[PDB]
Amino acid sequence: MKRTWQPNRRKRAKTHGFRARMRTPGGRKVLKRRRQKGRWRLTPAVRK
Amino acid sequence: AVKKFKPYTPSRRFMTVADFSEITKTEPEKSLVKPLKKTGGRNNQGRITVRFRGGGHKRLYRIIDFKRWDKVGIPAKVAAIEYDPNRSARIALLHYVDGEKRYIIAPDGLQVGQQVVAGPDAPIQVGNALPLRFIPVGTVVHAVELEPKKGAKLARAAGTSAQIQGREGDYVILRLPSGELRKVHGECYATVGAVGNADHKNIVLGKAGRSRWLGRRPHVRGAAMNPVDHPHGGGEGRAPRGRPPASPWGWQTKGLKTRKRRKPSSRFIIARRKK
RNA sequence: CCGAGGGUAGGGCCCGUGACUGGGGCGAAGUCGUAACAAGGUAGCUGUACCGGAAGGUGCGGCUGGAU
RNA sequence: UGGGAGAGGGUGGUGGAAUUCCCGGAGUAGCGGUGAAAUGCGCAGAUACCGGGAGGAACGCCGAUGGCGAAGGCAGCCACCUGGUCCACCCGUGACGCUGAGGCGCGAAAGCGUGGGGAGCAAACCGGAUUAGAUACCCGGGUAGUCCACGCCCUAAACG
RNA sequence: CGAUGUCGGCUCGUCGCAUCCUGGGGCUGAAGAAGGUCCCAAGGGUUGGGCUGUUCGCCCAUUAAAGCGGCACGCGAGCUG
RNA sequence: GAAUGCCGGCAUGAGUAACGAUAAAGAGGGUGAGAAUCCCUCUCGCCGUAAGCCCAAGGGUUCCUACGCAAUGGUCGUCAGCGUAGGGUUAGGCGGGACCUAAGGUGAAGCCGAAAGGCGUAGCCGAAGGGCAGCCGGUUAAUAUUCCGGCCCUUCCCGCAGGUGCGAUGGGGGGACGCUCUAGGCUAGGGGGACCGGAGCCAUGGACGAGCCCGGCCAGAAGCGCAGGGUGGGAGGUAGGCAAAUCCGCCUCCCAACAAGCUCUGCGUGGUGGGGAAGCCCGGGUGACAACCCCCCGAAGCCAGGGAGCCAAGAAAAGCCUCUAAGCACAACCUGCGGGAACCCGUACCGCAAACCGACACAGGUGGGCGGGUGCAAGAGCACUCAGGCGCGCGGGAGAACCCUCGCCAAGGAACUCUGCAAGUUGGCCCCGUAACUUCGGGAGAAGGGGUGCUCCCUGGGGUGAUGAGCCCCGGGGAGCCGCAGUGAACAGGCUCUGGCGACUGUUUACCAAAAACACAGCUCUCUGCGAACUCGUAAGAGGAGGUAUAGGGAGCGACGCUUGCCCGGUGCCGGAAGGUCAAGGGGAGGGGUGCAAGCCCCGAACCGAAGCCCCGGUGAACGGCGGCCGUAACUAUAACGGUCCUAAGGUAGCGAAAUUCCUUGUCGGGUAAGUUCCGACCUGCACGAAAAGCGUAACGACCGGAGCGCUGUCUCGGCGAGGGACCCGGUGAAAUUGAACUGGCCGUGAAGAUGCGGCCUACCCGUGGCAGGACGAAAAGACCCCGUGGAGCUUUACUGCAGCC
RNA sequence: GAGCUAGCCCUGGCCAGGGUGAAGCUGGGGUGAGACCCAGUGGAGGCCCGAACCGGUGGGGGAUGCAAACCCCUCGGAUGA
Ligand SMILES: [Mg+2]
Ligand SMILES: [Mg+2]
Ligand SMILES: [Mg+2]
Ligand SMILES: [Mg+2]
Ligand SMILES: [Mg+2]
Ligand SMILES: [Mg+2]
Ligand SMILES: [Mg+2]
Ligand SMILES: [Mg+2]
Ligand SMILES: [Mg+2]
Ligand SMILES: [Mg+2]
Ligand SMILES: [Mg+2]
Ligand SMILES: [Mg+2]
Ligand SMILES: [Mg+2]
Ligand SMILES: [Mg+2]
Ligand SMILES: [Mg+2]
Ligand SMILES: [Mg+2]
Ligand SMILES: [Mg+2]
Ligand SMILES: [Mg+2]
Ligand SMILES: [Mg+2]
Ligand SMILES: [Mg+2]
Ligand SMILES: [Mg+2]
Ligand SMILES: [Mg+2]
Ligand SMILES: [Mg+2]
Ligand SMILES: [Mg+2]
Ligand SMILES: [Mg+2]
Ligand SMILES: [Mg+2]
Ligand SMILES: [Mg+2]
Ligand SMILES: [Mg+2]
Ligand SMILES: [Mg+2]
Ligand SMILES: [Mg+2]
Ligand SMILES: [Mg+2]
Ligand SMILES: [Mg+2]
Ligand SMILES: [Mg+2]
Ligand SMILES: [Mg+2]
Ligand SMILES: [Mg+2]
Ligand SMILES: [Mg+2]
Ligand SMILES: [Mg+2]
Ligand SMILES: [Mg+2]
Ligand SMILES: [Mg+2]
Ligand SMILES: [Mg+2]
Ligand SMILES: [Mg+2]
Ligand SMILES: [Mg+2]
Ligand SMILES: [Mg+2]
Ligand SMILES: [Mg+2]
Ligand SMILES: [Mg+2]
Ligand SMILES: [Mg+2]
Ligand SMILES: [Mg+2]
Ligand SMILES: [Mg+2]
Ligand SMILES: [Mg+2]
Ligand SMILES: [Mg+2]
Ligand SMILES: [Mg+2]
Ligand SMILES: [Mg+2]
Ligand SMILES: [Mg+2]
Ligand SMILES: [Mg+2]
Ligand SMILES: [Mg+2]
Ligand SMILES: [Mg+2]
Ligand SMILES: [Mg+2]
Ligand SMILES: [Mg+2]
Ligand SMILES: [Mg+2]
Ligand SMILES: [Mg+2]
Ligand SMILES: [Mg+2]
Ligand SMILES: [Mg+2]
Ligand SMILES: [Mg+2]
Ligand SMILES: [Mg+2]
Ligand SMILES: [Mg+2]
Ligand SMILES: [Mg+2]
Ligand SMILES: [Mg+2]
Ligand SMILES: [Mg+2]
Ligand SMILES: [Mg+2]
Ligand SMILES: [Mg+2]
Ligand SMILES: [Mg+2]
Ligand SMILES: [Mg+2]
Ligand SMILES: [Mg+2]
Ligand SMILES: [Mg+2]
Ligand SMILES: [Mg+2]
Ligand SMILES: [Mg+2]
Ligand SMILES: [Mg+2]
Ligand SMILES: [Mg+2]
Ligand SMILES: [Mg+2]
Ligand SMILES: [Mg+2]
Ligand SMILES: [Mg+2]
Ligand SMILES: [Mg+2]
Ligand SMILES: [Mg+2]
Ligand SMILES: [Mg+2]
Ligand SMILES: [Mg+2]
Ligand SMILES: [Mg+2]
Ligand SMILES: [Mg+2]
Ligand SMILES: [Mg+2]
Ligand SMILES: [Mg+2]
Ligand SMILES: [Mg+2]
Ligand SMILES: [Mg+2]
Ligand SMILES: [Mg+2]
Ligand SMILES: [Mg+2]
Ligand SMILES: [Mg+2]
Ligand SMILES: [Mg+2]
Ligand SMILES: [Mg+2]
Ligand SMILES: [Mg+2]
Ligand SMILES: [Mg+2]
Ligand SMILES: [Mg+2]
Ligand SMILES: [Mg+2]
Ligand SMILES: [Mg+2]
Ligand SMILES: [Mg+2]
Ligand SMILES: [Mg+2]
Ligand SMILES: [Mg+2]
Ligand SMILES: [Mg+2]
Ligand SMILES: [Mg+2]
Ligand SMILES: [Mg+2]
Ligand SMILES: [Mg+2]
Ligand SMILES: [Mg+2]
Ligand SMILES: [Mg+2]
Ligand SMILES: [Mg+2]
Ligand SMILES: [Mg+2]
Ligand SMILES: [Mg+2]
Ligand SMILES: [Mg+2]
Ligand SMILES: [Mg+2]
Ligand SMILES: [Mg+2]
Ligand SMILES: [Mg+2]
Ligand SMILES: [Mg+2]
Ligand SMILES: [Mg+2]
Ligand SMILES: [Mg+2]
Ligand SMILES: [Mg+2]
Ligand SMILES: [Mg+2]
Ligand SMILES: [Mg+2]
Ligand SMILES: [Mg+2]
Ligand SMILES: [Mg+2]
Ligand SMILES: [Mg+2]
Ligand SMILES: [Mg+2]
Ligand SMILES: [Mg+2]
Ligand SMILES: [Mg+2]
Ligand SMILES: [Mg+2]
Ligand SMILES: [Mg+2]
Ligand SMILES: [Mg+2]
Ligand SMILES: [Mg+2]
Ligand SMILES: [Mg+2]
Ligand SMILES: [Mg+2]
Ligand SMILES: [Mg+2]
Ligand SMILES: [Mg+2]
Ligand SMILES: [Mg+2]
Ligand SMILES: [Mg+2]
Ligand SMILES: [Mg+2]
Ligand SMILES: [Mg+2]
Ligand SMILES: [Mg+2]
Ligand SMILES: [Mg+2]
Ligand SMILES: [Mg+2]
Ligand SMILES: [Mg+2]
Ligand SMILES: [Mg+2]
Ligand SMILES: [Mg+2]
Ligand SMILES: [Mg+2]
Ligand SMILES: [Mg+2]
Ligand SMILES: [Mg+2]
Ligand SMILES: [Mg+2]
Ligand SMILES: [Mg+2]
Ligand SMILES: [Mg+2]
Ligand SMILES: [Mg+2]
Ligand SMILES: [Mg+2]
Ligand SMILES: [Mg+2]
Ligand SMILES: [Mg+2]
Ligand SMILES: [Mg+2]
Ligand SMILES: [Mg+2]
Ligand SMILES: [Mg+2]
Ligand SMILES: [Mg+2]
Ligand SMILES: [Mg+2]
Ligand SMILES: [Mg+2]
Ligand SMILES: [Mg+2]
Ligand SMILES: [Mg+2]
Ligand SMILES: [Mg+2]
Ligand SMILES: [Mg+2]
Ligand SMILES: [Mg+2]
Ligand SMILES: [Mg+2]
Ligand SMILES: [Mg+2]
Ligand SMILES: [Mg+2]
Ligand SMILES: [Mg+2]
Ligand SMILES: [Mg+2]
Ligand SMILES: [Mg+2]
Ligand SMILES: [Mg+2]
Ligand SMILES: [Mg+2]
Ligand SMILES: [Mg+2]
Ligand SMILES: [Mg+2]
Ligand SMILES: [Mg+2]
Ligand SMILES: [Mg+2]
Ligand SMILES: [Mg+2]
Ligand SMILES: [Mg+2]
Ligand SMILES: [Mg+2]
Ligand SMILES: [Mg+2]
Ligand SMILES: [Mg+2]
Ligand SMILES: [Mg+2]
Ligand SMILES: [Mg+2]
Ligand SMILES: [Mg+2]
Ligand SMILES: [Mg+2]
Ligand SMILES: [Mg+2]
Ligand SMILES: [Mg+2]
Ligand SMILES: [Mg+2]
Ligand SMILES: [Mg+2]
Ligand SMILES: [Mg+2]
Ligand SMILES: [Mg+2]
Ligand SMILES: [Mg+2]
Ligand SMILES: [Mg+2]
Ligand SMILES: [Mg+2]
Ligand SMILES: [Mg+2]
Ligand SMILES: [Mg+2]
Ligand SMILES: [Mg+2]
Ligand SMILES: [Mg+2]
Ligand SMILES: [Mg+2]
Ligand SMILES: [Mg+2]
Ligand SMILES: [Mg+2]
Ligand SMILES: [Mg+2]
Ligand SMILES: [Mg+2]
Ligand SMILES: [Mg+2]
Ligand SMILES: [Mg+2]
Ligand SMILES: [Mg+2]
Ligand SMILES: [Mg+2]
Ligand SMILES: [Mg+2]
Ligand SMILES: [Mg+2]
Ligand SMILES: [Mg+2]
Ligand SMILES: [Mg+2]
Ligand SMILES: [Mg+2]
Ligand SMILES: [Mg+2]
Ligand SMILES: [Mg+2]
Ligand SMILES: [Mg+2]
Ligand SMILES: [Mg+2]
Ligand SMILES: [Mg+2]
Ligand SMILES: [Mg+2]
Ligand SMILES: [Mg+2]
Ligand SMILES: [Mg+2]
Ligand SMILES: [Mg+2]
Ligand SMILES: [Mg+2]
Ligand SMILES: [Mg+2]
Ligand SMILES: [Mg+2]
Ligand SMILES: [Mg+2]
Ligand SMILES: [Mg+2]
Ligand SMILES: [Mg+2]
Ligand SMILES: [Mg+2]
Ligand SMILES: [Mg+2]
Ligand SMILES: [Mg+2]
Ligand SMILES: [Mg+2]
Ligand SMILES: [Mg+2]
Ligand SMILES: [Mg+2]
Ligand SMILES: [Mg+2]
Ligand SMILES: [Mg+2]
Ligand SMILES: [Mg+2]
Ligand SMILES: [Mg+2]
Ligand SMILES: [Mg+2]
Ligand SMILES: [Mg+2]
Ligand SMILES: [Mg+2]
Ligand SMILES: [Mg+2]
Ligand SMILES: [Mg+2]
Ligand SMILES: [Mg+2]
Ligand SMILES: [Mg+2]
Ligand SMILES: [Mg+2]
Ligand SMILES: [Mg+2]
Ligand SMILES: [Mg+2]
Ligand SMILES: [Mg+2]
Ligand SMILES: [Mg+2]
Ligand SMILES: [Mg+2]
Ligand SMILES: [Mg+2]
Ligand SMILES: [Mg+2]
Ligand SMILES: [Mg+2]
Ligand SMILES: [Mg+2]
Ligand SMILES: [Mg+2]
Ligand SMILES: [Mg+2]
Ligand SMILES: [Mg+2]
Ligand SMILES: [Mg+2]
Ligand SMILES: [Mg+2]
Ligand SMILES: [Mg+2]
Ligand SMILES: [Mg+2]
């Protein structure tokens, strides 16, 4: 049947992307945490 | 009259449709239509705040002249009577000798070709608008303003009308469509005659589909739900109300008055509605 | 080929009969009240409507085939 | 052809008395109702009186033993549209007539449908009396209905 | 109770005997035929159907007879549900 | 040494299950160390509304070539979407951006919120919508509307010529729209040709033929032709389109009007450039100077912004045109022409799938376009087949049980079983014919029956032509032929009688329930006068609604028909300026602490003082409720009638052993040989009953009962046959589970059901195919049940708070 | 976290073929005029049959699956909520 992952690049960037995270208090804390932990990618990589 | 159907489907057996006899023109004036932003019953937070709305036929909004004292003394010709999907009344296209074009809602008995005009000096004839203080006691009237220059608010639906019952000071006394007796300021404008399409209320929708075309989505009873949903929810099998009948939000819904008691307009309302 | 008829199927009319049920007639030696005939004790009768154990009542309109 | 009388019919408008309700005043100990009563209403101010308003229904006197219509039936006043009928002239037609199974139409009240309207009255219903009892008669309440439109119903002591 | 799956049916049997039938007996209120009642006897046999989930039971048509029990009310790592 | 402990390693099950659609393979040749598995050829099979082709998403080098085979690939591997390396994606016209707006998002002004932040008309962002200029062929191993060739085209800049009051983010027009049906004329696509081109063929009995086989086109500016779309012209007046306006709107007058004209698109033609088959020969050559024509069918596509009808009444903004304002009028704009200029990103490949979503090369899921031919009435259905693509990444044997999927069956025909579950039967089209009942539509494909192929002869109408031939469509009549059988294969209702529930089409527990549940038109109650009520939010602000009582919210009931009684004492709600009770506050009789004092401070009675409650009344389609005992009639039986206790009042109409009836399989009647079910009745209704509606109701139902006809392997009662497994051989190779085991029966015993204890009996050692009685077999620290002063959801006249409201 | 799912909003798209034959319209009949009746025309509908498409009724298979919901046969809707 139809499963839960239905990839869509605009949806990915518009939801989890860097500018989305920057817009909001929780989103900025996400970035701060991810940078503090040393994540190589702060945000999901999307081809665009 | 309303149009009936032969029972060639289970739904055409009861379905009735308006005859549309008064309508002379089937396209709206392009300069007076604008898109209606459909809401689905959702507010600016995106939340349903009026339940069971949406999915109705697309409509354009015809701009309606509910002011009318905008053009005192300037007569106009009744050019057309048109269908308006946004209201129960029909609309009438006015061609002012100004060259300006406007819609008013159509009174009963209005004639394409007839002249109408607004003002203190307007004749007491169907389609004319005057301040309430210059309309004779007893004449039935519609598109009534509630305060001066704020716009017509009263007696706007199909077949409705208010009647002038007398004068008292700067106020006239109207019987509203609801039977209520209320004072309205004499400088409020009104249009002599009653609203047209009085057959409107004899329409039989006929099937669930017709309600859906109007944007009315199905209404599910509180008794059909569960306790988390509604006071009437739950019970094994069917259940009577088992408590005074309530809304989804808990307030009683068989008699409980809800008008705010200290409201300033109480000073102007003489007798609450009848029936 | 037609063809007595036999067969399959589906209709129409009539008669007999049926758990049970509706009222009708007669019987009369019963129980209940007394509706009508006298102004019959609320004048009567009436079409209809609603109602009551029962006769009947009441409403609306009508007739006199109503006493004073 | 020229006249007549008439609640004959349909539509629209419109007038006054009265009942009820609401508002304002004035005012107080009862009012109402009956054969007599009680229920009911009333000191939370009724009834009786004055003023204002709203609303429906029916039209006092004229009115009669009267008039009109085929019958059912028709009653304030005005206008419009409209039917039947009588009289005088003896002008025109030339038996064109009478009746009439079927058909078609009209058809009091009650009742029905859809929608209005709702003052008074009032089936059902509730209460009070009456009474041996009183699912009645009498009394206090009271919903359909009674009224308007449209569509049905098609009955009668629809009788002379 | 860190699980011993349950009624009834189907299938497959096997056992007990307080024996329904068939075999052998005594008593009889056993003339005969047919029964009654007790004793021996478990080798084999013990039908098809209507009703109802039913076991049971009632009924139809037969039969030599249409037995009663046990096996985790035998049998769901065999089926049904 | 144990914690169903944690991490790791390694065992058991076991050479076992399995190797992922039953579309299918065989041989020959080659390559190589090695070949069922790679390449080549021939034969065979499968898809063909796809299992072929194109596009968008998503994926991200998987594309091409060379060289490889450790791992990956369910076997193998010389092969590969794998390893290494090199190469490959070319645009003014295709898509997106340097254009527009939609929901929405953001957000000058502005509003609100402890902070963070929430709103917010304009503006801006936002597309798969609007707008906008490229078609055909060729070329690479791999890109092509991008490179090349031919023929076209757009915008910007500049210059020239001609023309005009030029000029805008401002005004106006336009853009600009639904659903269903549909005209004319075309094109795509298709079929036929005795005609045109073509390599060849003559088999095996016949045919040198009007034979077979193959092909018979594509793009194209101007002009022209055909078919359509769009649009009236002139003048005068002018107070409206938030300045102006000559534009637009409105009024009047005159020509024109279903015309033409002007304009725009489509199709045809069109200079020109292309393409071009079978067969044969080694992707290429040849065929070939290829031919490139006629007829018929024909779109759902085009002309298009076409037409008609209907109600549910069907985006915006820019590009475009027109008007004018500042301005500027040596400019500027318009038209023609010419030269110059013309950027950024995508482009490979997979794309119904082995490259995307599902951990897998996973029988699942994935939007748009093309989707040929013949026959079956039609069609995208079904059978076959073209182009194209495939045989599904383990095989070879064997011919047991058993399992799956499938075929047939004597006699019987539901006897099966909870149930005809399942499977038969029926089955398309044409004709004949068709009942109760009904809301007059239906029920209805009711039921039931007849026809169906091929040949010859005659004949009726239509389409295209031309009016005719030809072609193509729809027919009618007569006579015959064959078979067991003519929708000869595939696709394609079994039917009826009668109850319950729900009116109906719909909706639902994604993944055990599709229903009688939800919804539904419709009915009623009730709230709401507009800054409505109500809802969300602390608020601002929103929805309601750019609506206004014929409207909006809440509640119940649930088409329709006939109806919906009695009880207002309790609770609810509504009304009630009296009265009672009532908090803060007011008031301050009186009393107190302290001070030498003036004074400071504290307590405090009467009285005034809201909502609420009490109190009076109304109210049921508001919550709800709707009795008992005794007696009495010509036999018995019963009780119309009377008495009496209680109640707020004692269940009306209708229905009733019912989706409700315990006793119960009530009784009686029907159906059956037999009927705990079913249907019809009765009424002692344990415990129906009137909008949690009562009783009916045509039609409808993958709902749940009962019966019959037809037909059957459901069964008596089973037999045979088919293929995929199971079995054997070669290749690869799991699993849960597992204290260790050298693991028999009985009768006993034992924590009460023993392979393991006692006694006895039986028993050589080890496997393979099978069956499931036991190992209280496996799985999941029992869901039941209880316990825990464990949890959570829900309720209320439990407690106590809070919002909200008064 | 609404790339699954539920609802709404904006903007696009899709639904072979066949059957039934409402209103309206024209003609005719009818009447004082009508109602109405008949025929032709017409093409309505939460109409009918049936692919795509959307479903998930009954049975069977599957059950360390092809699959953490699949397969086969059968069945519901298919211009509409
Ligand atoms: Mg996942
Ligand atoms: Mg998706
Ligand atoms: Mg992805
Ligand atoms: Mg995307
Ligand atoms: Mg996107
Ligand atoms: Mg997205
Ligand atoms: Mg982002
Ligand atoms: Mg990481
Ligand atoms: Mg790094
Ligand atoms: Mg992140
Ligand atoms: Mg009208
Ligand atoms: Mg109708
Ligand atoms: Mg109709
Ligand atoms: Mg009709
Ligand atoms: Mg019907
Ligand atoms: Mg119907
Ligand atoms: Mg109409
Ligand atoms: Mg109209
Ligand atoms: Mg606009
Ligand atoms: Mg709007
Ligand atoms: Mg918003
Ligand atoms: Mg938001
Ligand atoms: Mg939010
Ligand atoms: Mg809503
Ligand atoms: Mg309208
Ligand atoms: Mg209407
Ligand atoms: Mg209605
Ligand atoms: Mg609508
Ligand atoms: Mg509703
Ligand atoms: Mg509902
Ligand atoms: Mg529920
Ligand atoms: Mg919740
Ligand atoms: Mg709660
Ligand atoms: Mg609750
Ligand atoms: Mg409840
Ligand atoms: Mg309950
Ligand atoms: Mg419930
Ligand atoms: Mg329930
Ligand atoms: Mg219950
Ligand atoms: Mg319920
Ligand atoms: Mg229910
Ligand atoms: Mg209730
Ligand atoms: Mg309850
Ligand atoms: Mg209760
Ligand atoms: Mg409230
Ligand atoms: Mg006001
Ligand atoms: Mg014979
Ligand atoms: Mg008497
Ligand atoms: Mg009398
Ligand atoms: Mg009675
Ligand atoms: Mg009685
Ligand atoms: Mg009475
Ligand atoms: Mg009379
Ligand atoms: Mg008189
Ligand atoms: Mg007289
Ligand atoms: Mg004469
Ligand atoms: Mg009458
Ligand atoms: Mg009457
Ligand atoms: Mg009446
Ligand atoms: Mg008595
Ligand atoms: Mg009544
Ligand atoms: Mg009534
Ligand atoms: Mg008389
Ligand atoms: Mg246990
Ligand atoms: Mg365990
Ligand atoms: Mg266990
Ligand atoms: Mg003897
Ligand atoms: Mg003995
Ligand atoms: Mg003995
Ligand atoms: Mg024996
Ligand atoms: Mg034995
Ligand atoms: Mg039995
Ligand atoms: Mg029993
Ligand atoms: Mg018995
Ligand atoms: Mg015998
Ligand atoms: Mg036993
Ligand atoms: Mg036991
Ligand atoms: Mg027991
Ligand atoms: Mg057992
Ligand atoms: Mg047993
Ligand atoms: Mg068992
Ligand atoms: Mg089992
Ligand atoms: Mg069992
Ligand atoms: Mg077991
Ligand atoms: Mg077992
Ligand atoms: Mg069973
Ligand atoms: Mg069960
Ligand atoms: Mg230890
Ligand atoms: Mg373990
Ligand atoms: Mg373990
Ligand atoms: Mg461990
Ligand atoms: Mg571990
Ligand atoms: Mg080992
Ligand atoms: Mg082996
Ligand atoms: Mg083994
Ligand atoms: Mg090989
Ligand atoms: Mg090899
Ligand atoms: Mg090969
Ligand atoms: Mg094939
Ligand atoms: Mg094909
Ligand atoms: Mg990937
Ligand atoms: Mg490539
Ligand atoms: Mg390898
Ligand atoms: Mg290898
Ligand atoms: Mg190797
Ligand atoms: Mg491998
Ligand atoms: Mg694999
Ligand atoms: Mg090699
Ligand atoms: Mg590979
Ligand atoms: Mg290279
Ligand atoms: Mg180019
Ligand atoms: Mg630029
Ligand atoms: Mg943009
Ligand atoms: Mg775009
Ligand atoms: Mg473009
Ligand atoms: Mg071109
Ligand atoms: Mg290339
Ligand atoms: Mg528009
Ligand atoms: Mg559009
Ligand atoms: Mg549609
Ligand atoms: Mg062409
Ligand atoms: Mg063809
Ligand atoms: Mg030869
Ligand atoms: Mg042409
Ligand atoms: Mg002007
Ligand atoms: Mg060639
Ligand atoms: Mg050549
Ligand atoms: Mg040549
Ligand atoms: Mg089409
Ligand atoms: Mg409408
Ligand atoms: Mg439009
Ligand atoms: Mg806009
Ligand atoms: Mg200037
Ligand atoms: Mg110019
Ligand atoms: Mg740039
Ligand atoms: Mg680039
Ligand atoms: Mg490319
Ligand atoms: Mg591939
Ligand atoms: Mg698929
Ligand atoms: Mg594979
Ligand atoms: Mg796959
Ligand atoms: Mg093709
Ligand atoms: Mg066929
Ligand atoms: Mg066919
Ligand atoms: Mg099909
Ligand atoms: Mg072919
Ligand atoms: Mg294969
Ligand atoms: Mg394979
Ligand atoms: Mg073998
Ligand atoms: Mg198969
Ligand atoms: Mg047989
Ligand atoms: Mg049979
Ligand atoms: Mg038979
Ligand atoms: Mg059955
Ligand atoms: Mg068939
Ligand atoms: Mg019948
Ligand atoms: Mg009929
Ligand atoms: Mg038939
Ligand atoms: Mg039938
Ligand atoms: Mg033949
Ligand atoms: Mg055959
Ligand atoms: Mg087939
Ligand atoms: Mg069929
Ligand atoms: Mg069957
Ligand atoms: Mg039947
Ligand atoms: Mg029912
Ligand atoms: Mg239903
Ligand atoms: Mg239902
Ligand atoms: Mg019904
Ligand atoms: Mg319903
Ligand atoms: Mg329904
Ligand atoms: Mg449907
Ligand atoms: Mg579930
Ligand atoms: Mg489910
Ligand atoms: Mg689940
Ligand atoms: Mg679930
Ligand atoms: Mg299931
Ligand atoms: Mg379900
Ligand atoms: Mg269903
Ligand atoms: Mg549901
Ligand atoms: Mg429901
Ligand atoms: Mg109803
Ligand atoms: Mg709300
Ligand atoms: Mg709130
Ligand atoms: Mg706001
Ligand atoms: Mg709005
Ligand atoms: Mg609003
Ligand atoms: Mg609004
Ligand atoms: Mg509104
Ligand atoms: Mg419902
Ligand atoms: Mg009826
Ligand atoms: Mg009663
Ligand atoms: Mg009460
Ligand atoms: Mg009360
Ligand atoms: Mg009372
Ligand atoms: Mg209570
Ligand atoms: Mg007083
Ligand atoms: Mg003091
Ligand atoms: Mg009522
Ligand atoms: Mg109570
Ligand atoms: Mg109640
Ligand atoms: Mg009762
Ligand atoms: Mg009973
Ligand atoms: Mg019943
Ligand atoms: Mg039930
Ligand atoms: Mg009961
Ligand atoms: Mg019981
Ligand atoms: Mg019972
Ligand atoms: Mg029982
Ligand atoms: Mg019985
Ligand atoms: Mg049964
Ligand atoms: Mg049963
Ligand atoms: Mg009884
Ligand atoms: Mg309820
Ligand atoms: Mg119920
Ligand atoms: Mg159904
Ligand atoms: Mg169903
Ligand atoms: Mg068998
Ligand atoms: Mg065979
Ligand atoms: Mg076999
Ligand atoms: Mg085989
Ligand atoms: Mg075999
Ligand atoms: Mg061997
Ligand atoms: Mg050992
Ligand atoms: Mg043991
Ligand atoms: Mg033992
Ligand atoms: Mg042992
Ligand atoms: Mg031991
Ligand atoms: Mg030992
Ligand atoms: Mg020992
Ligand atoms: Mg031992
Ligand atoms: Mg032994
Ligand atoms: Mg075993
Ligand atoms: Mg065991
Ligand atoms: Mg053991
Ligand atoms: Mg076991
Ligand atoms: Mg066991
Ligand atoms: Mg645990
Ligand atoms: Mg436990
Ligand atoms: Mg437990
Ligand atoms: Mg557990
Ligand atoms: Mg559970
Ligand atoms: Mg326990
Ligand atoms: Mg405790
Ligand atoms: Mg404790
Ligand atoms: Mg808790
Ligand atoms: Mg759209
Ligand atoms: Mg469709
Ligand atoms: Mg026709
Ligand atoms: Mg028409
Ligand atoms: Mg349909
Ligand atoms: Mg259908
Ligand atoms: Mg879906
Ligand atoms: Mg299924
Ligand atoms: Mg089946
Ligand atoms: Mg099967
Ligand atoms: Mg299974
Ligand atoms: Mg499947
Ligand atoms: Mg299937
Ligand atoms: Mg089917
Ligand atoms: Mg269908
Ligand atoms: Mg269809
Ligand atoms: Mg249809
Ligand atoms: Mg439908
Ligand atoms: Mg729609």
Tab-separated table of C-alpha atoms (C1' of nucleotides) in Angstrom, chain B residues 34 53 61 83 87 98-99 153 254 263 272, chain F residues 239 249 313 525 528 530 545-548:
chain	number	residue	atom	x	y	z
B	34	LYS	CA	-15.317	40.478	-6.907
B	53	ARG	CA	-19.159	24.416	6.505
B	61	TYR	CA	-19.663	38.452	-4.830
B	83	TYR	CA	-29.646	36.009	-9.569
B	87	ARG	CA	-28.270	36.135	-0.609
B	98	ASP	CA	-25.416	59.639	-13.939
B	99	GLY	CA	-23.964	56.818	-15.971
B	153	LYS	CA	-29.029	46.118	8.239
B	254	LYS	CA	-33.894	24.602	25.235
B	263	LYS	CA	-26.761	45.911	26.509
B	272	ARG	CA	-39.154	41.435	22.355
F	239	A	C1'	-23.533	66.211	-13.245
F	249	G	C1'	-20.758	54.593	-18.703
F	313	A	C1'	-24.860	30.954	-10.815
F	525	C	C1'	-38.381	23.038	20.148
F	528	U	C1'	-30.114	35.404	18.219
F	530	C	C1'	-26.537	42.934	14.234
F	545	A	C1'	-20.977	37.171	7.186
F	546	G	C1'	-18.996	41.539	3.574
F	547	G	C1'	-24.819	37.417	5.793
F	548	U	C1'	-29.518	40.415	8.669
